[PDB]
Design a binder for this molecule. Structure first.
Ligand SMILES: [K+]
Ligand SMILES: [K+]
Ligand SMILES: [K+]
Ligand SMILES: [K+]
Ligand SMILES: [K+]
Ligand SMILES: [K+]
Ligand SMILES: [K+]
Ligand SMILES: [K+]
Ligand SMILES: [Zn+2]
Ligand SMILES: [Zn+2]
Ligand SMILES: [Zn+2]
Ligand SMILES: [Zn+2]
Lengths: 372, 377, 372, 377
């Protein structure tokens, strides 16, 4: 398999003002001696370094892209949003929204981040590669058209899909969002649309806080083309396998996508500070294998994975590597040193049974229960 | 209330070799640009800084202590363990066990950490203070007599309890361990003993990995004097409140402690990388309030809180502050900026009902009668 | 000796936006993975920690102070400067001047920094202590009345001296500034004054860049009451001993101070990134011993040392400890592990002779040559 | 011009135990909250990132290489040194010598660092490239055959030169070492040899501490084929230009090198914590321009630059970029934001005159005639 890896070093130069994890410095929050904001360059940089040291980089088709044009950005965001962002970026940064801090030059880097997503979809639709991975930072799946949130400043995936519709005329795109938080940006933009099926697996009530959303299935022309799977906090490998087999694959089977796009955050990993789930690198490998199979059956193999969250410096690189190995069909020498440990921590039989029953009920609510 | 705060700046200078969270650097684990080992000084240091800027430190009895003597340490650890640790500490550090890396000078700093625990028990038993908090790093609750594990190198609480029995002759001590991980060191040392009741609240299967332990209730003379409460991963405030009121308080009521020691890790907080629970600073405030009340009813107020885990630099300081406010009866100006957010993330009604039923069954399995707090005559 | 140590934990919570050493992030300057701005909390924090671990803290009179009032600040800075600073502080920070970046809450912390200086002078003038040390961050000696510079936001020492003149009526204050950079704020404010002798030892041309200033000796009523000693870059222990014996002590002898204030930066140390001098901890011990002796001979022992620069995390704590040991007359167990190494690096005989001749000429220019 | 850039990401993963700048943690040296050892990955990594965002990397021949073989390493180091290093590397690291701390896996990464130097010489001798830059970390110029020192564990350049003599039979190699510290490893190995001219520009007495070395000009067969230029501390751009034109170029002209290797440390930059010199990125650009010209006149353009020291995270990337622009003949968009500021800090006329006179006397002491650049026939 021919996998394109879209990456630009400048995406690792985006940096907010001083934060302790997600907490802006000031008042009772002391400036950190070392760390900084949870969305730090180093998580993404360490994925890139492990790809290089593993030699996977040599087996990929390495590519960059021009930044997103105004035309592409304006298909989803208003001009005054672009101005406000630009102005705040030139004045050293600050807070652009709710949990949406930016640094100096963040505007140009966010444009580049959106450009990589655009180019990755384009490459896979033009037949330049069988599938693709876009290491775009800052992420996109929380961003609303006129509102930055959750560390996201442009709706990278939506911007990329609208650019793909204009240039190629792809009619049916599925967005599977396994970032551990709710993909509310993507949900909102495509809520009354049937040309995009948006599916979000997420920790129930995590982010946005208190939101589950099982009953929000889309509206009018979009009714039945948005699916939320609020997994109980503490869930791990089995919960996600169960969700994939009962909800996600049946839903994709029904929808018949011509292109699958994955909002791939790795913040469901077992050591992430920003969620409470218990995935290991083989979970992400297994999920990628399942969605790639769906892409091969319906979409001519056309699958793009766009990097979103993941806030464990130590463990995100192994999770990301697992996805890219699975995308490319190349198994590197890297062994995940936390995998066997995380297997031992999984939910017991009773908790697994409890979550499994909830997913059976949910699959029944969505009218996805087999039979076939 | 008169609260002693046992602290020494040197405890913040203990530092392992390069690690990425818990992963030793080498092989496929790249060295971190900034951070380092998850048991970093900065979590504890930021607690101490917040105590200082909040004004709480001025209202406490700030105290240090001499390091633990050989005699005190030898009551639990063998001489050859002390020698091996000493030797590795003098040769720049290395791995002393399973998830037990040490740095240069770690031996002397671990002795100091144990000394603060010893002194904090001593101060509360001598009536020098009503209660105490010991900011002892490195922690202790995983350490076995001849095996360092879980970032722990001496069994701080066991060393402190044995020193307290020698000096004061206290007959019944309860150890409540609400660090999110299983307090296996304390469990093992006191497993056939009825003079120490060890209770561990912990995430089922977290650390040590795969261990739940509900059926391990102690053996022979110690049968019924060890209780494990394996809470389901993802649990938060209600799960813990429920465990406290159905298991912990009934168990303490039956045991009639003359001293309560809390192994207080803050790694059950909702943003900790090393567990999956969802506590906020008011959870820890509420737990401290309940155990302080038990100490006042049975133990003449005698309560000591010994710092164990907690690996979120940003949030541990607010959790630690909550406990110390509750210990001292002083409310500072500090407002927890994550409290309201974490409240919105809690388990839904169905998951809370599920965990609650498991605790009811567990309380029944331990033969615990749901009696309610009353004073001992 | 009874030494007061003025310190507040909140001074360590001041933090600028992202910088690589002195370079604001943006353009070609990548955000640092770890470090940050060169004026970081950790240099000062590590001095405080070493004081605690050495047990020196137990031998000092530990004290804090209220923040500087508007009245005290307004004796040197205009109200609109206070407003502008405040407003920028409330809007998350930014650039307040030339090499003068601030963070959120920096206004309140700078007020506290000025308050510690005020209180330290007050304590020594009121006879509460024999001498004092103020660990005030952010520093002050570069700040002009209407212009923040060199990481300084209020003229801490000038604010403290004017507060001391109002409350006690001290008539003659000497300011010895051995921070490695030029104390241009103090120079400017007292340039036409004979009630304050300002002496600056500094690396020739370092900061402000290109400035030597030997010929700037004060003007009108202040003529002869400002002395600049531009030491050649690369100079170390002997250069400074030579300057102290030929210029500084004679100058103090002539002036007859009732109070000596030292702007004590430790950035002349041999491993500082922001200068090129080669001092070790015994140099600072020796300089403190000399100025304390002058204070005992003229000023009834009244000496205050106010912390200014110093940007080596590793080495500043040993230099600071040396001064405080000398102030208090208490020798701790701490051994400087770099002292013997730095001794071996000192300028050779020929370079020492060259610098010594330049200081003889300079002492002659100032009309300080012995004789007696 | 065709410039090979020898680089491997694994060279950035070498990491010693906890240090505060050069000071091992322990005793009175508190562990750093953030930074670590002064020889940190980030200085080199930020050079590589700036090369990438400037667009320079796209215009270079980016290349890696296999690690140095045992055969290559054994040409300079003894087997027991390799074994001791290997063993300490496998046991989590420690101190291999005087200012020579290693981490876990440091043995394999040091082999790779030496391999890049070997390959970079090989590529330029085989005509695969006109010149080359090897970003080899950890560095080499302090390492003696049986003694690691100054953060160096193998004698990268010596290992590379001996491998080049075996494979190609090159007869005359010049090593110009403008790392700010004395290149004592290279000096010692080639001290009685006339096939290698070693020149070190260095701050008088810096590292090794107290060493100047002007009278150490080599011995017997090597007499006149080692030159030390101890520049006064505080010197900047003019001092170095003056040394290049009065000592270095005359010396190279006399020697007639068939290959020039530069031990390129950037720690003479004006903000380095580990020295006291005042270079800016144009200084390094000017030095590279002069040595490239010498290589074109004598050595058919054959020049290799091997990265050694440089400990300013903020400023080293701009200095490194300047050299690579000069090596390749490509000027990027990058503007050095510290250049104009550093120009204003330079030594005054009197101090420049003083240093210049010392270099005139030194050139006379070496018996160096001030001939000017001409082509070899
Ligand atoms: K999601
Ligand atoms: K939809
Ligand atoms: K526990
Ligand atoms: K027991
Ligand atoms: K000065
Ligand atoms: K004056
Ligand atoms: K050199
Ligand atoms: K030679
Ligand atoms: Zn997320
Ligand atoms: Zn724990
Ligand atoms: Zn300074
Ligand atoms: Zn060097």
């Amino acid at each position: 398999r021919r996998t394109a890896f879209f990456f630009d070093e400048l995406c690792l130069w985006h940096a907010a003002g001083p934060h302790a994890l997600t907490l802006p410095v000031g008042g009772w929050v002391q400036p950190p001696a070392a760390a900084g904001h949870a969305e730090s360059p180093e998580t993404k940089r360490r994925l890139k370094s492990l790809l290089d040291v593993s030699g996977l980089t040599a087996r990929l088709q390495l590519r960059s892209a021009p930044p997103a044009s105004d035309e592409d950005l304006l298909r989803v965001h208003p001009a005054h949003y672009l101005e406000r962002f630009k102005a705040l970026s030139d004045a050293g940064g600050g807070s652009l929204g709710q949990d949406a801090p930016i640094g100096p030059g963040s505007y140009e880097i966010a444009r580049l981040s959106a450009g990589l997503a655009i180019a990755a979809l384009d490459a896979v639709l033009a037949g330049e590669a069988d599938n693709a991975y876009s290491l775009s930072r800052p992420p996109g799946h929380h961003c609303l058209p006129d509102q930055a949130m959750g560390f996201c400043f442009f709706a990278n995936i939506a911007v990329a899909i609208e650019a793909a519709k204009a240039r190629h005329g792809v009619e049916r795109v599925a967005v599977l969002d396994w970032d551990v938080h709710h993909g509310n940006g993507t949900q909102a933009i495509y809520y009354r649309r049937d040309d995009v099926l948006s599916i979000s697996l997420h920790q129930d009530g995590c982010f946005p806080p208190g939101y589950s959303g099982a009953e929000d299935i889309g509206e009018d022309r979009g009714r039945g083309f948005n699916l939320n799977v609020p997994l109980l906090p503490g869930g791990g490998h089995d919960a996600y396998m169960q969700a994939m087999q009962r909800i996600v694959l049946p839903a994709l089977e029904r929808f018949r996508p011509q292109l699958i796009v994955v909002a791939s955050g790795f913040d469901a990993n077992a050591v992430d500070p920003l969620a409470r789930m218990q995935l290991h690198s083989d979970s992400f490998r297994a999920m990628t294998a399942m969605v790639r199979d769906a892409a091969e059956r319906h979409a001519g193999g056309r699958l793009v994975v766009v990097h979103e969250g993941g806030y464990s410096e130590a463990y995100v690189p192994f999770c990301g590597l697992a996805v890219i190995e699975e995308l490319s069909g190349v198994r590197s020498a890297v062994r995940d040193p936390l995998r066997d440990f995380i297997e031992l921590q999984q939910p017991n039989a009773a908790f697994r049974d409890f979550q499994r029953q909830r997913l059976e009920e949910l699959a029944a609510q969505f009218g996805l229960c087999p039979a076939q």
